[PDB]
JSON list of C-alpha atoms and ligand atoms in Angstrom, two decimals:
[
{"chain": "J", "resi": 1, "resn": "UNK", "atom": "CA", "xyz": [61.70, 130.19, 98.90]},
{"chain": "J", "resi": 2, "resn": "UNK", "atom": "CA", "xyz": [63.62, 132.96, 100.71]},
{"chain": "J", "resi": 3, "resn": "UNK", "atom": "CA", "xyz": [67.30, 131.95, 101.10]},
{"chain": "J", "resi": 4, "resn": "UNK", "atom": "CA", "xyz": [68.61, 130.95, 104.54]},
{"chain": "J", "resi": 5, "resn": "UNK", "atom": "CA", "xyz": [70.76, 134.08, 104.32]},
{"chain": "J", "resi": 6, "resn": "UNK", "atom": "CA", "xyz": [71.02, 137.10, 102.08]},
{"chain": "J", "resi": 7, "resn": "UNK", "atom": "CA", "xyz": [74.70, 136.14, 101.51]},
{"chain": "J", "resi": 8, "resn": "UNK", "atom": "CA", "xyz": [73.79, 132.68, 100.15]},
{"chain": "J", "resi": 9, "resn": "UNK", "atom": "CA", "xyz": [72.34, 134.33, 97.01]},
{"chain": "J", "resi": 10, "resn": "UNK", "atom": "CA", "xyz": [75.76, 135.78, 96.13]},
{"chain": "J", "resi": 11, "resn": "UNK", "atom": "CA", "xyz": [77.07, 132.26, 95.39]},
{"chain": "J", "resi": 12, "resn": "UNK", "atom": "CA", "xyz": [74.50, 130.65, 93.01]},
{"chain": "J", "resi": 13, "resn": "UNK", "atom": "CA", "xyz": [76.82, 131.18, 90.02]},
{"chain": "J", "resi": 14, "resn": "UNK", "atom": "CA", "xyz": [80.53, 131.30, 89.19]},
{"chain": "J", "resi": 15, "resn": "UNK", "atom": "CA", "xyz": [82.34, 133.93, 91.31]},
{"chain": "J", "resi": 16, "resn": "UNK", "atom": "CA", "xyz": [85.81, 135.29, 90.48]},
{"chain": "J", "resi": 17, "resn": "UNK", "atom": "CA", "xyz": [88.30, 135.02, 93.38]},
{"chain": "J", "resi": 18, "resn": "UNK", "atom": "CA", "xyz": [91.46, 136.94, 94.25]},
{"chain": "J", "resi": 19, "resn": "UNK", "atom": "CA", "xyz": [93.90, 135.86, 96.93]},
{"chain": "J", "resi": 20, "resn": "UNK", "atom": "CA", "xyz": [96.66, 138.02, 98.40]},
{"chain": "J", "resi": 21, "resn": "UNK", "atom": "CA", "xyz": [99.08, 136.75, 101.10]},
{"chain": "J", "resi": 22, "resn": "UNK", "atom": "CA", "xyz": [102.02, 138.43, 102.79]},
{"chain": "J", "resi": 23, "resn": "UNK", "atom": "CA", "xyz": [104.15, 136.05, 104.86]},
{"chain": "J", "resi": 24, "resn": "UNK", "atom": "CA", "xyz": [107.20, 135.95, 107.10]},
{"chain": "J", "resi": 25, "resn": "UNK", "atom": "CA", "xyz": [108.44, 132.55, 108.22]},
{"chain": "J", "resi": 26, "resn": "UNK", "atom": "CA", "xyz": [111.51, 132.61, 110.48]},
{"chain": "J", "resi": 27, "resn": "UNK", "atom": "CA", "xyz": [112.33, 136.00, 108.84]},
{"chain": "J", "resi": 28, "resn": "UNK", "atom": "CA", "xyz": [111.91, 134.65, 105.29]},
{"chain": "J", "resi": 29, "resn": "UNK", "atom": "CA", "xyz": [109.50, 137.16, 103.73]},
{"chain": "J", "resi": 30, "resn": "UNK", "atom": "CA", "xyz": [107.35, 136.32, 100.70]},
{"chain": "J", "resi": 31, "resn": "UNK", "atom": "CA", "xyz": [104.12, 137.25, 98.92]},
{"chain": "J", "resi": 32, "resn": "UNK", "atom": "CA", "xyz": [101.62, 135.08, 97.06]},
{"chain": "J", "resi": 33, "resn": "UNK", "atom": "CA", "xyz": [99.01, 136.28, 94.56]},
{"chain": "J", "resi": 34, "resn": "UNK", "atom": "CA", "xyz": [96.14, 134.03, 93.46]},
{"chain": "J", "resi": 35, "resn": "UNK", "atom": "CA", "xyz": [93.42, 134.25, 90.76]},
{"chain": "J", "resi": 36, "resn": "UNK", "atom": "CA", "xyz": [90.64, 131.85, 89.86]},
{"chain": "J", "resi": 37, "resn": "UNK", "atom": "CA", "xyz": [86.94, 131.17, 90.37]},
{"chain": "J", "resi": 38, "resn": "UNK", "atom": "CA", "xyz": [84.58, 129.30, 92.65]},
{"chain": "J", "resi": 39, "resn": "UNK", "atom": "CA", "xyz": [81.25, 127.60, 91.99]},
{"chain": "J", "resi": 40, "resn": "UNK", "atom": "CA", "xyz": [79.63, 126.80, 95.38]},
{"chain": "J", "resi": 41, "resn": "UNK", "atom": "CA", "xyz": [76.80, 124.92, 93.66]},
{"chain": "J", "resi": 42, "resn": "UNK", "atom": "CA", "xyz": [79.44, 122.19, 93.06]},
{"chain": "J", "resi": 43, "resn": "UNK", "atom": "CA", "xyz": [81.69, 123.01, 96.06]},
{"chain": "J", "resi": 44, "resn": "UNK", "atom": "CA", "xyz": [84.30, 123.74, 93.40]},
{"chain": "J", "resi": 45, "resn": "UNK", "atom": "CA", "xyz": [87.42, 125.97, 93.43]},
{"chain": "J", "resi": 46, "resn": "UNK", "atom": "CA", "xyz": [89.97, 126.44, 90.65]},
{"chain": "J", "resi": 47, "resn": "UNK", "atom": "CA", "xyz": [92.92, 128.78, 91.35]},
{"chain": "J", "resi": 48, "resn": "UNK", "atom": "CA", "xyz": [96.43, 129.56, 90.26]},
{"chain": "J", "resi": 49, "resn": "UNK", "atom": "CA", "xyz": [98.87, 130.98, 92.83]},
{"chain": "J", "resi": 50, "resn": "UNK", "atom": "CA", "xyz": [102.15, 132.72, 92.08]},
{"chain": "J", "resi": 51, "resn": "UNK", "atom": "CA", "xyz": [104.97, 133.63, 94.46]},
{"chain": "J", "resi": 52, "resn": "UNK", "atom": "CA", "xyz": [105.56, 137.24, 93.46]},
{"chain": "J", "resi": 53, "resn": "UNK", "atom": "CA", "xyz": [108.74, 137.65, 95.56]},
{"chain": "J", "resi": 54, "resn": "UNK", "atom": "CA", "xyz": [110.76, 134.84, 93.97]},
{"chain": "J", "resi": 55, "resn": "UNK", "atom": "CA", "xyz": [111.22, 131.36, 95.48]},
{"chain": "J", "resi": 56, "resn": "UNK", "atom": "CA", "xyz": [108.66, 130.35, 98.10]},
{"chain": "J", "resi": 57, "resn": "UNK", "atom": "CA", "xyz": [110.65, 129.66, 101.35]},
{"chain": "J", "resi": 58, "resn": "UNK", "atom": "CA", "xyz": [108.16, 127.01, 102.51]},
{"chain": "J", "resi": 59, "resn": "UNK", "atom": "CA", "xyz": [106.44, 124.15, 100.58]},
{"chain": "J", "resi": 60, "resn": "UNK", "atom": "CA", "xyz": [103.31, 125.11, 98.60]},
{"chain": "J", "resi": 61, "resn": "UNK", "atom": "CA", "xyz": [101.23, 122.35, 100.26]},
{"chain": "J", "resi": 62, "resn": "UNK", "atom": "CA", "xyz": [101.77, 124.04, 103.66]},
{"chain": "J", "resi": 63, "resn": "UNK", "atom": "CA", "xyz": [99.87, 127.14, 102.38]},
{"chain": "J", "resi": 64, "resn": "UNK", "atom": "CA", "xyz": [96.74, 125.48, 100.91]},
{"chain": "J", "resi": 65, "resn": "UNK", "atom": "CA", "xyz": [94.55, 125.84, 103.94]},
{"chain": "J", "resi": 66, "resn": "UNK", "atom": "CA", "xyz": [95.52, 129.51, 104.35]},
{"chain": "J", "resi": 67, "resn": "UNK", "atom": "CA", "xyz": [95.05, 130.49, 100.68]},
{"chain": "J", "resi": 69, "resn": "UNK", "atom": "CA", "xyz": [87.47, 130.65, 100.94]},
{"chain": "J", "resi": 70, "resn": "UNK", "atom": "CA", "xyz": [85.22, 128.20, 102.76]},
{"chain": "J", "resi": 71, "resn": "UNK", "atom": "CA", "xyz": [82.21, 130.20, 101.49]},
{"chain": "J", "resi": 72, "resn": "UNK", "atom": "CA", "xyz": [82.66, 128.08, 98.29]},
{"chain": "J", "resi": 73, "resn": "UNK", "atom": "CA", "xyz": [81.80, 124.85, 100.15]},
{"chain": "J", "resi": 74, "resn": "UNK", "atom": "CA", "xyz": [78.75, 123.00, 98.89]},
{"chain": "J", "resi": 75, "resn": "UNK", "atom": "CA", "xyz": [76.16, 122.91, 101.66]},
{"chain": "J", "resi": 76, "resn": "UNK", "atom": "CA", "xyz": [73.45, 120.35, 100.81]},
{"chain": "J", "resi": 77, "resn": "UNK", "atom": "CA", "xyz": [69.99, 121.93, 100.73]},
{"chain": "J", "resi": 78, "resn": "UNK", "atom": "CA", "xyz": [69.02, 120.29, 104.05]},
{"chain": "J", "resi": 79, "resn": "UNK", "atom": "CA", "xyz": [72.05, 121.90, 105.73]},
{"chain": "J", "resi": 80, "resn": "UNK", "atom": "CA", "xyz": [71.82, 125.43, 104.27]},
{"chain": "J", "resi": 81, "resn": "UNK", "atom": "CA", "xyz": [70.76, 126.89, 107.66]},
{"chain": "J", "resi": 82, "resn": "UNK", "atom": "CA", "xyz": [74.27, 125.92, 108.93]},
{"chain": "J", "resi": 83, "resn": "UNK", "atom": "CA", "xyz": [76.32, 127.85, 106.35]},
{"chain": "J", "resi": 84, "resn": "UNK", "atom": "CA", "xyz": [78.03, 130.57, 108.40]},
{"chain": "J", "resi": 85, "resn": "UNK", "atom": "CA", "xyz": [80.48, 131.50, 105.66]},
{"chain": "J", "resi": 86, "resn": "UNK", "atom": "CA", "xyz": [78.03, 132.65, 102.99]},
{"chain": "J", "resi": 87, "resn": "UNK", "atom": "CA", "xyz": [75.80, 134.29, 105.64]},
{"chain": "J", "resi": 88, "resn": "UNK", "atom": "CA", "xyz": [78.53, 136.81, 106.55]},
{"chain": "J", "resi": 89, "resn": "UNK", "atom": "CA", "xyz": [78.70, 138.05, 102.95]},
{"chain": "J", "resi": 90, "resn": "UNK", "atom": "CA", "xyz": [79.11, 140.55, 101.33]},
{"chain": "J", "resi": 91, "resn": "UNK", "atom": "CA", "xyz": [80.61, 142.32, 104.37]},
{"chain": "J", "resi": 92, "resn": "UNK", "atom": "CA", "xyz": [82.72, 139.22, 104.99]},
{"chain": "J", "resi": 93, "resn": "UNK", "atom": "CA", "xyz": [84.48, 137.54, 107.90]},
{"chain": "J", "resi": 94, "resn": "UNK", "atom": "CA", "xyz": [87.78, 137.43, 109.72]},
{"chain": "J", "resi": 95, "resn": "UNK", "atom": "CA", "xyz": [89.38, 133.99, 109.62]},
{"chain": "J", "resi": 96, "resn": "UNK", "atom": "CA", "xyz": [92.25, 133.32, 112.02]},
{"chain": "J", "resi": 97, "resn": "UNK", "atom": "CA", "xyz": [94.26, 130.16, 112.57]},
{"chain": "J", "resi": 98, "resn": "UNK", "atom": "CA", "xyz": [97.19, 128.67, 114.42]},
{"chain": "J", "resi": 99, "resn": "UNK", "atom": "CA", "xyz": [98.67, 125.83, 112.42]},
{"chain": "J", "resi": 100, "resn": "UNK", "atom": "CA", "xyz": [101.02, 123.79, 114.59]},
{"chain": "J", "resi": 101, "resn": "UNK", "atom": "CA", "xyz": [103.38, 121.58, 112.60]},
{"chain": "J", "resi": 102, "resn": "UNK", "atom": "CA", "xyz": [104.17, 118.51, 114.70]},
{"chain": "J", "resi": 103, "resn": "UNK", "atom": "CA", "xyz": [107.77, 118.59, 116.01]},
{"chain": "J", "resi": 104, "resn": "UNK", "atom": "CA", "xyz": [108.31, 121.89, 114.22]},
{"chain": "J", "resi": 105, "resn": "UNK", "atom": "CA", "xyz": [107.16, 125.52, 114.09]},
{"chain": "J", "resi": 106, "resn": "UNK", "atom": "CA", "xyz": [103.77, 127.16, 113.72]},
{"chain": "J", "resi": 107, "resn": "UNK", "atom": "CA", "xyz": [101.95, 129.53, 111.38]},
{"chain": "J", "resi": 108, "resn": "UNK", "atom": "CA", "xyz": [99.60, 132.14, 112.72]},
{"chain": "J", "resi": 109, "resn": "UNK", "atom": "CA", "xyz": [97.29, 133.63, 110.10]},
{"chain": "J", "resi": 110, "resn": "UNK", "atom": "CA", "xyz": [94.76, 136.45, 109.98]},
{"chain": "J", "resi": 111, "resn": "UNK", "atom": "CA", "xyz": [92.59, 136.89, 106.92]},
{"chain": "J", "resi": 112, "resn": "UNK", "atom": "CA", "xyz": [89.66, 138.95, 105.80]},
{"chain": "J", "resi": 113, "resn": "UNK", "atom": "CA", "xyz": [87.40, 137.28, 103.25]},
{"chain": "J", "resi": 114, "resn": "UNK", "atom": "CA", "xyz": [84.85, 139.62, 101.66]},
{"chain": "J", "resi": 115, "resn": "UNK", "atom": "CA", "xyz": [83.41, 140.90, 98.40]},
{"chain": "J", "resi": 116, "resn": "UNK", "atom": "CA", "xyz": [85.08, 143.72, 96.50]},
{"chain": "J", "resi": 117, "resn": "UNK", "atom": "CA", "xyz": [82.48, 144.42, 93.79]},
{"chain": "J", "resi": 118, "resn": "UNK", "atom": "CA", "xyz": [81.52, 140.99, 92.47]},
{"chain": "J", "resi": 119, "resn": "UNK", "atom": "CA", "xyz": [84.92, 139.52, 93.28]},
{"chain": "J", "resi": 120, "resn": "UNK", "atom": "CA", "xyz": [85.50, 137.37, 96.38]},
{"chain": "J", "resi": 121, "resn": "UNK", "atom": "CA", "xyz": [88.76, 138.49, 97.96]},
{"chain": "J", "resi": 122, "resn": "UNK", "atom": "CA", "xyz": [90.89, 136.64, 100.51]},
{"chain": "J", "resi": 123, "resn": "UNK", "atom": "CA", "xyz": [93.58, 138.92, 102.07]},
{"chain": "J", "resi": 124, "resn": "UNK", "atom": "CA", "xyz": [95.99, 137.17, 104.48]},
{"chain": "J", "resi": 125, "resn": "UNK", "atom": "CA", "xyz": [98.93, 137.96, 106.75]},
{"chain": "J", "resi": 126, "resn": "UNK", "atom": "CA", "xyz": [100.93, 134.88, 107.75]},
{"chain": "J", "resi": 127, "resn": "UNK", "atom": "CA", "xyz": [103.57, 134.70, 110.49]},
{"chain": "J", "resi": 128, "resn": "UNK", "atom": "CA", "xyz": [105.70, 131.54, 110.92]},
{"chain": "J", "resi": 129, "resn": "UNK", "atom": "CA", "xyz": [108.02, 131.06, 113.91]},
{"chain": "J", "resi": 130, "resn": "UNK", "atom": "CA", "xyz": [110.18, 128.36, 115.52]},
{"chain": "J", "resi": 131, "resn": "UNK", "atom": "CA", "xyz": [110.78, 126.32, 112.39]},
{"chain": "J", "resi": 132, "resn": "UNK", "atom": "CA", "xyz": [113.75, 123.97, 112.28]},
{"chain": "J", "resi": 133, "resn": "UNK", "atom": "CA", "xyz": [116.30, 124.84, 109.62]},
{"chain": "J", "resi": 134, "resn": "UNK", "atom": "CA", "xyz": [116.28, 121.29, 108.27]},
{"chain": "J", "resi": 135, "resn": "UNK", "atom": "CA", "xyz": [112.81, 120.21, 109.32]},
{"chain": "J", "resi": 136, "resn": "UNK", "atom": "CA", "xyz": [110.24, 119.24, 106.69]},
{"chain": "J", "resi": 137, "resn": "UNK", "atom": "CA", "xyz": [109.10, 122.84, 106.08]},
{"chain": "J", "resi": 138, "resn": "UNK", "atom": "CA", "xyz": [112.24, 124.98, 105.74]},
{"chain": "J", "resi": 139, "resn": "UNK", "atom": "CA", "xyz": [114.02, 121.89, 104.39]},
{"chain": "J", "resi": 140, "resn": "UNK", "atom": "CA", "xyz": [111.37, 121.44, 101.66]},
{"chain": "J", "resi": 141, "resn": "UNK", "atom": "CA", "xyz": [110.87, 117.76, 102.39]},
{"chain": "J", "resi": 142, "resn": "UNK", "atom": "CA", "xyz": [107.14, 117.67, 101.60]},
{"chain": "J", "resi": 143, "resn": "UNK", "atom": "CA", "xyz": [105.68, 116.03, 98.50]},
{"chain": "J", "resi": 144, "resn": "UNK", "atom": "CA", "xyz": [103.74, 118.15, 96.05]},
{"chain": "J", "resi": 145, "resn": "UNK", "atom": "CA", "xyz": [100.36, 116.48, 96.71]},
{"chain": "J", "resi": 146, "resn": "UNK", "atom": "CA", "xyz": [97.45, 116.86, 99.14]},
{"chain": "J", "resi": 147, "resn": "UNK", "atom": "CA", "xyz": [95.23, 114.58, 101.15]},
{"chain": "J", "resi": 148, "resn": "UNK", "atom": "CA", "xyz": [91.49, 114.54, 101.75]},
{"chain": "J", "resi": 149, "resn": "UNK", "atom": "CA", "xyz": [90.34, 115.90, 105.14]},
{"chain": "J", "resi": 150, "resn": "UNK", "atom": "CA", "xyz": [87.39, 116.67, 107.41]},
{"chain": "J", "resi": 151, "resn": "UNK", "atom": "CA", "xyz": [87.10, 120.18, 108.81]},
{"chain": "J", "resi": 152, "resn": "UNK", "atom": "CA", "xyz": [85.13, 120.01, 112.06]},
{"chain": "J", "resi": 153, "resn": "UNK", "atom": "CA", "xyz": [83.02, 123.11, 112.65]},
{"chain": "J", "resi": 154, "resn": "UNK", "atom": "CA", "xyz": [81.25, 124.26, 115.85]},
{"chain": "J", "resi": 155, "resn": "UNK", "atom": "CA", "xyz": [79.37, 127.44, 116.68]},
{"chain": "J", "resi": 156, "resn": "UNK", "atom": "CA", "xyz": [80.97, 130.09, 118.87]},
{"chain": "J", "resi": 157, "resn": "UNK", "atom": "CA", "xyz": [77.85, 131.90, 120.13]},
{"chain": "J", "resi": 158, "resn": "UNK", "atom": "CA", "xyz": [79.76, 134.24, 122.49]},
{"chain": "J", "resi": 159, "resn": "UNK", "atom": "CA", "xyz": [81.64, 135.64, 119.48]},
{"chain": "J", "resi": 160, "resn": "UNK", "atom": "CA", "xyz": [78.77, 135.41, 116.96]},
{"chain": "J", "resi": 161, "resn": "UNK", "atom": "CA", "xyz": [80.99, 133.11, 114.88]},
{"chain": "J", "resi": 162, "resn": "UNK", "atom": "CA", "xyz": [82.45, 129.64, 114.44]},
{"chain": "J", "resi": 163, "resn": "UNK", "atom": "CA", "xyz": [85.52, 127.61, 115.39]},
{"chain": "J", "resi": 164, "resn": "UNK", "atom": "CA", "xyz": [87.01, 124.69, 113.52]},
{"chain": "J", "resi": 165, "resn": "UNK", "atom": "CA", "xyz": [89.47, 121.99, 114.45]},
{"chain": "J", "resi": 166, "resn": "UNK", "atom": "CA", "xyz": [91.17, 119.59, 112.04]},
{"chain": "J", "resi": 167, "resn": "UNK", "atom": "CA", "xyz": [94.38, 117.73, 111.29]},
{"chain": "J", "resi": 168, "resn": "UNK", "atom": "CA", "xyz": [96.11, 118.22, 107.96]},
{"chain": "J", "resi": 169, "resn": "UNK", "atom": "CA", "xyz": [98.43, 115.40, 106.83]},
{"chain": "J", "resi": 170, "resn": "UNK", "atom": "CA", "xyz": [101.36, 116.45, 104.61]},
{"chain": "J", "resi": 171, "resn": "UNK", "atom": "CA", "xyz": [103.15, 113.52, 102.87]},
{"chain": "J", "resi": 172, "resn": "UNK", "atom": "CA", "xyz": [106.95, 113.63, 103.42]},
{"chain": "J", "resi": 173, "resn": "UNK", "atom": "CA", "xyz": [109.27, 112.57, 100.56]},
{"chain": "J", "resi": 174, "resn": "UNK", "atom": "CA", "xyz": [110.51, 109.61, 102.67]},
{"chain": "J", "resi": 175, "resn": "UNK", "atom": "CA", "xyz": [107.00, 108.11, 102.92]},
{"chain": "J", "resi": 176, "resn": "UNK", "atom": "CA", "xyz": [106.23, 109.50, 106.36]},
{"chain": "J", "resi": 177, "resn": "UNK", "atom": "CA", "xyz": [103.68, 112.18, 107.32]},
{"chain": "J", "resi": 178, "resn": "UNK", "atom": "CA", "xyz": [103.96, 115.69, 108.75]},
{"chain": "J", "resi": 179, "resn": "UNK", "atom": "CA", "xyz": [100.88, 116.57, 110.79]},
{"chain": "J", "resi": 180, "resn": "UNK", "atom": "CA", "xyz": [99.67, 120.15, 110.81]},
{"chain": "J", "resi": 181, "resn": "UNK", "atom": "CA", "xyz": [97.11, 120.64, 113.58]},
{"chain": "J", "resi": 182, "resn": "UNK", "atom": "CA", "xyz": [94.69, 123.47, 112.72]},
{"chain": "J", "resi": 183, "resn": "UNK", "atom": "CA", "xyz": [92.77, 125.58, 115.19]},
{"chain": "J", "resi": 184, "resn": "UNK", "atom": "CA", "xyz": [90.49, 128.13, 113.53]},
{"chain": "J", "resi": 185, "resn": "UNK", "atom": "CA", "xyz": [88.23, 131.07, 114.41]},
{"chain": "J", "resi": 186, "resn": "UNK", "atom": "CA", "xyz": [85.89, 133.07, 112.17]},
{"chain": "J", "resi": 187, "resn": "UNK", "atom": "CA", "xyz": [83.91, 136.18, 113.09]},
{"chain": "J", "resi": 188, "resn": "UNK", "atom": "CA", "xyz": [81.68, 138.45, 110.96]},
{"chain": "J", "resi": 189, "resn": "UNK", "atom": "CA", "xyz": [82.96, 141.87, 109.82]},
{"chain": "J", "resi": 190, "resn": "UNK", "atom": "CA", "xyz": [79.47, 143.27, 109.28]},
{"chain": "J", "resi": 191, "resn": "UNK", "atom": "CA", "xyz": [76.66, 144.04, 111.68]},
{"chain": "J", "resi": 192, "resn": "UNK", "atom": "CA", "xyz": [74.12, 141.89, 109.78]},
{"chain": "J", "resi": 193, "resn": "UNK", "atom": "CA", "xyz": [72.96, 138.62, 111.36]},
{"chain": "J", "resi": 194, "resn": "UNK", "atom": "CA", "xyz": [74.81, 135.39, 110.55]},
{"chain": "J", "resi": 195, "resn": "UNK", "atom": "CA", "xyz": [74.01, 131.70, 110.65]},
{"chain": "J", "resi": 196, "resn": "UNK", "atom": "CA", "xyz": [75.41, 129.94, 113.74]},
{"chain": "J", "resi": 197, "resn": "UNK", "atom": "CA", "xyz": [75.70, 126.29, 112.76]},
{"chain": "J", "resi": 198, "resn": "UNK", "atom": "CA", "xyz": [75.02, 123.04, 114.54]},
{"chain": "J", "resi": 199, "resn": "UNK", "atom": "CA", "xyz": [78.08, 120.74, 114.68]},
{"chain": "J", "resi": 200, "resn": "UNK", "atom": "CA", "xyz": [79.13, 119.46, 111.26]},
{"chain": "J", "resi": 201, "resn": "UNK", "atom": "CA", "xyz": [82.20, 119.05, 109.03]},
{"chain": "J", "resi": 202, "resn": "UNK", "atom": "CA", "xyz": [83.46, 119.93, 105.57]},
{"chain": "J", "resi": 203, "resn": "UNK", "atom": "CA", "xyz": [84.80, 117.04, 103.55]},
{"chain": "J", "resi": 204, "resn": "UNK", "atom": "CA", "xyz": [87.65, 118.28, 101.36]},
{"chain": "J", "resi": 205, "resn": "UNK", "atom": "CA", "xyz": [89.65, 117.00, 98.42]},
{"chain": "J", "resi": 206, "resn": "UNK", "atom": "CA", "xyz": [92.44, 118.93, 96.66]},
{"chain": "J", "resi": 207, "resn": "UNK", "atom": "CA", "xyz": [94.60, 118.29, 93.57]},
{"chain": "J", "resi": 208, "resn": "UNK", "atom": "CA", "xyz": [97.86, 120.17, 93.06]},
{"chain": "J", "resi": 209, "resn": "UNK", "atom": "CA", "xyz": [99.44, 120.72, 89.63]},
{"chain": "J", "resi": 210, "resn": "UNK", "atom": "CA", "xyz": [101.79, 122.93, 87.60]},
{"chain": "J", "resi": 211, "resn": "UNK", "atom": "CA", "xyz": [101.23, 125.19, 84.58]},
{"chain": "J", "resi": 212, "resn": "UNK", "atom": "CA", "xyz": [103.76, 123.89, 82.07]},
{"chain": "J", "resi": 213, "resn": "UNK", "atom": "CA", "xyz": [104.30, 127.38, 80.60]},
{"chain": "J", "resi": 214, "resn": "UNK", "atom": "CA", "xyz": [104.83, 129.03, 83.96]},
{"chain": "J", "resi": 215, "resn": "UNK", "atom": "CA", "xyz": [108.42, 129.80, 84.96]},
{"chain": "J", "resi": 216, "resn": "UNK", "atom": "CA", "xyz": [107.59, 131.54, 88.27]},
{"chain": "J", "resi": 217, "resn": "UNK", "atom": "CA", "xyz": [107.26, 129.55, 91.51]},
{"chain": "J", "resi": 218, "resn": "UNK", "atom": "CA", "xyz": [103.56, 128.68, 91.49]},
{"chain": "J", "resi": 219, "resn": "UNK", "atom": "CA", "xyz": [100.72, 126.30, 92.35]},
{"chain": "J", "resi": 220, "resn": "UNK", "atom": "CA", "xyz": [97.65, 125.32, 90.37]},
{"chain": "J", "resi": 221, "resn": "UNK", "atom": "CA", "xyz": [94.85, 124.06, 92.60]},
{"chain": "J", "resi": 222, "resn": "UNK", "atom": "CA", "xyz": [91.58, 122.18, 92.03]},
{"chain": "J", "resi": 223, "resn": "UNK", "atom": "CA", "xyz": [89.49, 121.65, 95.17]},
{"chain": "J", "resi": 224, "resn": "UNK", "atom": "CA", "xyz": [86.11, 120.16, 96.09]},
{"chain": "J", "resi": 225, "resn": "UNK", "atom": "CA", "xyz": [84.47, 120.76, 99.43]},
{"chain": "J", "resi": 226, "resn": "UNK", "atom": "CA", "xyz": [81.09, 119.46, 100.63]},
{"chain": "J", "resi": 227, "resn": "UNK", "atom": "CA", "xyz": [79.46, 119.99, 104.00]},
{"chain": "J", "resi": 228, "resn": "UNK", "atom": "CA", "xyz": [78.33, 116.83, 105.82]},
{"chain": "J", "resi": 229, "resn": "UNK", "atom": "CA", "xyz": [77.56, 115.33, 109.22]},
{"chain": "J", "resi": 230, "resn": "UNK", "atom": "CA", "xyz": [73.87, 116.23, 109.52]},
{"chain": "J", "resi": 231, "resn": "UNK", "atom": "CA", "xyz": [71.09, 113.91, 108.16]},
{"chain": "J", "resi": 232, "resn": "UNK", "atom": "CA", "xyz": [67.71, 114.94, 106.67]},
{"chain": "I", "resi": 301, "resn": "LIG", "atom": "CA1", "xyz": [70.18, 123.60, 116.11]}
]
């Protein structure tokens, strides 16, 4: 009857989300602002992102992973493995290196936490060693998004988790641009967190445009469900 974590209880209903990103890729500076809502009961996110600095100097798809895994649906039998909600409201630090095959890399640091009743994701992104006419700076990536598995393991030493996964970005010629993700999350607060057994998040994302929106932007619908442990 008691929740597996105090934080879990913060997610039983619809939660408004704000996303703020400042980025610099190969010296191209940009900012992204996002608003929407999440409903963890259904592993559901709906968000609209706008590039507030003009044209985005990288493809929108390359920023999806960076731009709230606390909205994942953990099945009841797996709720003792939900690190993300357990760190709330104080939140967690989420860091990644995203290595684009035969191209540059993003390094990201984010803090995900509640501000009032709003779930906020604040991110700094740094991109280096991109090729001027590779798939990223050359904008050769299709505006779509594949379905992936995010493999999570406990990091007991750090009182947190790691994740490893491979993102596949479709290239306009029919090929694929791999983006290898290595990920670390650690709690911001001093409260206890849930350290999970090995499992994965199964993700699915749909990208669209707002037909009235003139700014460079991305509308996103995403479903994420934890899996990999039986009852
Ligand atoms: Ca165990």
